[PDB]
Design an enzyme around this catalytic site. Structure first.
Site, PDB file in Angstrom:
ATOM      1  N   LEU A  65     -32.179 -16.401  -4.858  1.00 52.36           N
ATOM      2  CA  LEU A  65     -31.524 -17.374  -4.009  1.00 52.36           C
ATOM      3  C   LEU A  65     -31.386 -16.956  -2.539  1.00 52.36           C
ATOM      4  CD1 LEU A  65     -30.832 -20.172  -5.715  1.00 52.36           C
ATOM      5  CD2 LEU A  65     -30.892 -18.118  -7.094  1.00 52.36           C
ATOM      6  N   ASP A  66     -30.726 -15.832  -2.264  1.00 51.76           N
ATOM      7  CA  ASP A  66     -30.490 -15.416  -0.876  1.00 51.76           C
ATOM      8  C   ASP A  66     -31.797 -15.157  -0.153  1.00 51.76           C
ATOM      9  OD1 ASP A  66     -27.988 -15.399   0.339  1.00 51.76           O
ATOM     10  OD2 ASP A  66     -27.291 -13.691  -0.843  1.00 51.76           O
TER      11      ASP A  66
ATOM     12  N   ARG B  37      -9.266 -12.582 -15.675  1.00 54.78           N
ATOM     13  CA  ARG B  37      -9.678 -12.726 -17.062  1.00 54.78           C
ATOM     14  C   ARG B  37     -11.157 -12.411 -17.211  1.00 54.78           C
ATOM     15  NH1 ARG B  37      -4.813 -15.807 -18.272  1.00 54.78           N
ATOM     16  NH2 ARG B  37      -4.458 -15.524 -20.528  1.00 54.78           N
TER      17      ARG B  37
ATOM     18  N   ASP C 222     -24.094 -18.268  -7.570  1.00 54.84           N
ATOM     19  CA  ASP C 222     -23.152 -17.912  -6.519  1.00 54.84           C
ATOM     20  C   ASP C 222     -23.468 -18.696  -5.240  1.00 54.84           C
ATOM     21  OD1 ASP C 222     -25.258 -16.559  -5.317  1.00 54.84           O
ATOM     22  OD2 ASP C 222     -24.349 -14.563  -5.517  1.00 54.84           O
TER      23      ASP C 222
ATOM     24  N   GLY D 262     -15.665 -19.765  -6.519  1.00 58.56           N
ATOM     25  CA  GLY D 262     -16.907 -19.377  -5.880  1.00 58.56           C
ATOM     26  C   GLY D 262     -18.036 -19.216  -6.878  1.00 58.56           C
TER      27      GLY D 262
ATOM     28  N   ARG E 199     -19.034  -5.100  -5.221  1.00 59.38           N
ATOM     29  CA  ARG E 199     -19.857  -5.640  -4.144  1.00 59.38           C
ATOM     30  C   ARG E 199     -18.971  -6.062  -2.989  1.00 59.38           C
ATOM     31  NH1 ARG E 199     -24.516 -10.386  -4.606  1.00 59.38           N
ATOM     32  NH2 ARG E 199     -22.764 -11.685  -5.252  1.00 59.38           N
TER      33      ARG E 199
ATOM     34  N   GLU F 123     -32.464  -8.680  -0.173  1.00 56.77           N
ATOM     35  CA  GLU F 123     -32.306 -10.123  -0.241  1.00 56.77           C
ATOM     36  C   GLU F 123     -32.457 -10.777   1.125  1.00 56.77           C
ATOM     37  OE1 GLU F 123     -27.375  -9.831  -0.526  1.00 56.77           O
ATOM     38  OE2 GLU F 123     -28.494 -11.274  -1.732  1.00 56.77           O
TER      39      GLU F 123
ATOM     40  N   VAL G 276     -22.400  -9.343 -13.375  1.00 53.28           N
ATOM     41  CA  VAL G 276     -21.752  -9.570 -12.077  1.00 53.28           C
ATOM     42  C   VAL G 276     -20.698 -10.641 -12.278  1.00 53.28           C
ATOM     43  CG1 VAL G 276     -22.088 -10.013  -9.611  1.00 53.28           C
ATOM     44  CG2 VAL G 276     -24.013  -9.250 -11.008  1.00 53.28           C
TER      45      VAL G 276
HETATM   46  O1  LIG Z   1     -29.960 -14.287  -5.211  1.00 58.98           O
HETATM   47  C1  LIG Z   1     -29.727 -14.854  -6.306  1.00 58.98           C
HETATM   48  O2  LIG Z   1     -30.620 -15.144  -7.156  1.00 58.98           O
HETATM   49  C2  LIG Z   1     -28.212 -15.219  -6.633  1.00 58.98           C
HETATM   50  O3  LIG Z   1     -27.430 -15.024  -5.484  1.00 58.98           O
HETATM   51  C3  LIG Z   1     -27.560 -14.335  -7.743  1.00 58.98           C
HETATM   52  C4  LIG Z   1     -26.500 -14.969  -8.618  1.00 58.98           C
HETATM   53  C5  LIG Z   1     -26.670 -16.143  -9.328  1.00 58.98           C
HETATM   54  N1  LIG Z   1     -25.497 -16.462 -10.051  1.00 58.98           N
HETATM   55  C6  LIG Z   1     -24.547 -15.475  -9.814  1.00 58.98           C
HETATM   56  C7  LIG Z   1     -23.231 -15.366 -10.307  1.00 58.98           C
HETATM   57  C8  LIG Z   1     -22.490 -14.284  -9.904  1.00 58.98           C
HETATM   58  C9  LIG Z   1     -23.037 -13.336  -9.033  1.00 58.98           C
HETATM   59  C10 LIG Z   1     -24.328 -13.442  -8.546  1.00 58.98           C
HETATM   60  C11 LIG Z   1     -25.136 -14.521  -8.915  1.00 58.98           C
HETATM   61 MG   LIG Z   2     -27.121 -12.623  -2.475  1.00 57.92          MG
END
Ligand SMILES: O=C(O)[C@H](O)Cc1c[nH]c2ccccc12
Ligand SMILES: [Mg+2]
Length: 717
Positions: free
Chosen positions: A451-452, A124, A623, A608, A329, A424, A117
């Site tokens: 995380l979410d 880049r 994220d 971000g 996404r 999530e 992701v």
């Molecule tokens: O729910 C979770 O565990 C996180 O939102 C996922 C996540 C962690 N680092 C990232 C970098 C790029 C894209 C998604 C992510």
């Molecule tokens: Mg999420």
């Protein structure tokens, strides 16, 4: 800004021009009819979008009130569950069914492997991720702590042979484990040849073939002195490169230069939580990169790779894709964006815009790229869209109807736009079967997170009492049950051989030994994919899929119900007096640094996602969901008297100079300390915590977007 009028909409000129001049040409879609479609879809679907958001708020208010009128310490699960059912939060479980989704590529239906992701605003990184379908195992081993930097084997400015030899030996063992020889070990190989369509490995005393000759997939160069040998295991390719006249080859007993692993089988190009995009200019930057990716001409010259040519065991010729198959996404149902406003000045829903625009743009990936020939993305004709932050099956149904209407606008066949359902949010977790059902003809994955989902867990039961610490959350009963339940539901819906069942991101980018030790849990748990933060991590996580037969694991899990609704609903409340004062302050510092470290880059620089040092200087790449959990946790502790507002302030003041220092490597960085209230980023951090309890489902975007716009505006001095 200026703006272009189309029916009830007023479209930012930068977006209007981008679509007309860059996105529409080549799709054969009439521009006037496209824009009319945008106006019509926005007009038709906006009220239901708003209704769904209002329903979230009503359900949360009732749950808040449920907790507030009770005093009985251990929650009565029978009464709690009854209540959730009464208010329409917990819906009936539908009858067993099998998903019908068709026209999906092999990368998604069949192959088990890592999924990368990457922020779509970073050209880049996006290009590297797309190219990460193949990755050097030697580079990944030499470059990280998977080979520990013990005495003698440390990385230098130049090649350390002791370390290199450790790399070679690690990879020989991988080969022995993954593509076993009939007799002996790859460690003692002196050479490789292809004879009568069979791979022959020379040993010192004899020759041998593969214990399973069918794992021989091909080669390059002369059969009698090949430049490489291609193997396959569990559906993933392994290529041994042979070059005695290379740095590493010259030191190798068989002249082996490298072992290349098929790594990031798929990649999610992200418009949501890993990017900061708060206006038409930001969105267009993202849309343009997505466009370049699909047309195959994105260049940053770093460009997109071609497919790989091989000679088949029998002597024929073939190719394998050289690129990661791309998802996009989109953002979820919550936010609006001023890239389009209506006649009242009201911002248009961003999720609806993303569907129209990323959908339009994806058409280019379904046709020949003018650069290197063949079409870039889906050969089977699908557009793969990951849809985050949905709550419940009505919200999934809405997304499907949105896609249906977009398809109509774009002249695409119905169900071209496939959905990756993120699990999530709790109201999705507890109604997961119903959510899958609502998308039964579109779903190409489900996936879980830390995380979410943890952020939603905290906010939903915000009024119940103080929650356990952030680090504790990842092992709580609710989450372990959520993880298993997600797998159970996917397998019961017939995902095996049809759709991905996916798990979460490894965030500790420098701790690769730990990743290799730990993340194996995910394919062992029946996940056919899981998230990695880098091409390097993708190559290392691929090892796991060579050790674990995911298809067999999934077959074994069939019919099992390993999580109950009660387990899913087990709120992660802290036990009475669980922490010492030093532990409380540690957790507060942890969360404030987490928030400050992330928010400063987001607000000041529009980044971000990046490698951010935590309180212990561990590099984490998280994220925006990191913000949701930390701010919710602190809000919860502030709500229940665990900490005071002075504790929060002092922690923010302690952590801010530390963050400033951790950002010394950055030319563009602007210190928050000591003029705290003069830093928009510092105020953003403060506001996320102090207003956390009042943000819908604890979402951080409303505050974050506003603050980033504030920064941008004052930058235009
Ligand atoms: O729910 C979770 O565990 C996180 O939102 C996922 C996540 C962690 N680092 C990232 C970098 C790029 C894209 C998604 C992510
Ligand atoms: Mg999420």
């Amino acid at each position: 800004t200026d703006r272009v009028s189309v029916g009830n909409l007023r479209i930012a000129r930068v977006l209007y021009d981008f679509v007309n001049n860059e996105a529409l040409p080549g799709t054969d879609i009439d521009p006037d009819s496209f824009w009319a479609g945008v106006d019509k879809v926005v007009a038709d679907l906006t009220p239901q979008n708003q209704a769904l958001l209002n329903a979230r708020d009503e359900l949360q208010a009732q749950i808040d009130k449920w907790h507030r009128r009770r005093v009985i310490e251990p929650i009565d699960m029978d009464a709690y569950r009854q209540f959730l059912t009464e208010i329409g939060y917990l819906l009936p479980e539908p009858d067993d069914f099998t998903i019908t989704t068709s026209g999906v590529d092999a990368e998604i239906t069949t192959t088990a492997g890592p999924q990368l992701v990457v922020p779509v605003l970073n050209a880049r990184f996006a290009l590297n991720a797309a190219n990460a379908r193949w990755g050097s195992l030697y580079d990944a081993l030499y470059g990280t702590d998977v080979i520990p930097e013990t005495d003698g084997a440390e990385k230098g400015p130049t090649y350390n042979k002791v370390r290199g030899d450790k790399v070679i030996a690690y990879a020989r063992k991988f080969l022995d484990d993954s593509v076993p020889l009939s007799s002996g070990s790859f460690g003692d190989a002196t050479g490789f040849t292809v004879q009568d369509g069979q791979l022959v490995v020379a040993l010192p005393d004899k020759s041998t073939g593969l214990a399973n000759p069918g794992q021989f997939a091909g080669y390059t160069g002369a059969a009698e002195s090949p430049t490489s040998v291609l193997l396959i295991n569990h559906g993933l390719h392994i290529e041994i490169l042979i070059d005695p006249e290379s740095q590493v080859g010259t030191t190798d007993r068989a002249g082996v230069k490298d072992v290349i692993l098929e790594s990031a089988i798929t990649t999610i190009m992200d418009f949501e939580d890993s990017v900061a995009a708060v206006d038409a200019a930001d969105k267009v930057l993202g849309y343009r990169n997505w466009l370049g990716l699909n047309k195959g001409d994105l260049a940053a010259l770093r460009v997109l790779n071609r497919d790989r040519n091989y000679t088949a065991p029998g002597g024929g010729q073939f190719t394998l894709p050289g690129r990661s198959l791309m998802f996009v996404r989109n953002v979820g149902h919550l936010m609006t964006n001023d890239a389009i406003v209506d006649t009242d000045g009201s911002e248009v829903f961003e999720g609806i815009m993303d569907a129209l625009f990323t959908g339009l743009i994806a058409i280019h990936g379904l046709k020949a790229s003018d650069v290197n020939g063949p079409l870039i993305n889906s050969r089977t004709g699908s557009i793969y869209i990951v849809k985050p932050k949905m709550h419940g099956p009505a919200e999934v149904a809405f997304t499907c109807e949105l896609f249906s209407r977009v398809e109509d606008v774009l002249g695409l066949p119905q169900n071209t736009m496939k959905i990756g359902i993120m699990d999530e949010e709790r109201r999705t977790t507890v109604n997961l079967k119903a959510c899958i059902k609502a998308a039964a003809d579109r779903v190409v994955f489900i996936n879980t997170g830390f995380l979410d989902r943890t952020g939603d867990e905290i906010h939903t039961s915000m009024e119940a009492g103080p929650m356990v610490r952030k680090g504790t959350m990842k092992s709580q009963p609710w989450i372990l049950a959520y993880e298993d339940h997600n797998v159970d539901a996917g397998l019961a819906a017939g995902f095996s051989g049809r759709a991905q069942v996916g798990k979460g991101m490894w965030t500790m980018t420098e701790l690769m030994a730990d990743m290799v030790e730990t993340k194996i849990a995910q394919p062992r748990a029946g996940a056919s994919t899981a998230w990695v933060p880098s091409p390097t991590a993708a190559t290392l996580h691929a090892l796991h899929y060579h050790q674990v037969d995911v298809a067999a694991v999934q077959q074994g899990l069939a019919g099992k119900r390993r999580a109950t609704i009660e387990q899913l609903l087990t709120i992660p409340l802290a036990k009475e007096l669980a922490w010492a004062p030093d532990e409380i302050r540690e957790e507060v510092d942890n969360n404030c640094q987490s928030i400050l470290g992330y928010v400063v880059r987001w607000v000041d620089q529009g980044v971000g996602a990046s490698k951010v040092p935590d309180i212990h200087d561990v590099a984490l790449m998280e994220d925006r969901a990191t913000l949701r959990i930390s701010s919710q946790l602190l809000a919860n502790w502030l709500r229940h008297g665990v900490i005071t507002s002075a504790d929060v302030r002092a922690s923010l003041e302690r952590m801010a100079p530390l963050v400033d220092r951790q950002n010394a490597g950055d030319v563009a960085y602007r210190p928050m300390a000591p003029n705290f209230d003069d830093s928009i980023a510092f105020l953003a951090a403060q506001e996320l915590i102090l207003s956390g309890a009042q943000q819908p489902n604890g979402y951080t975007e409303p505050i974050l977007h506003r603050r980033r716009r504030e920064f941008k505006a004052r930058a235009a001095e």
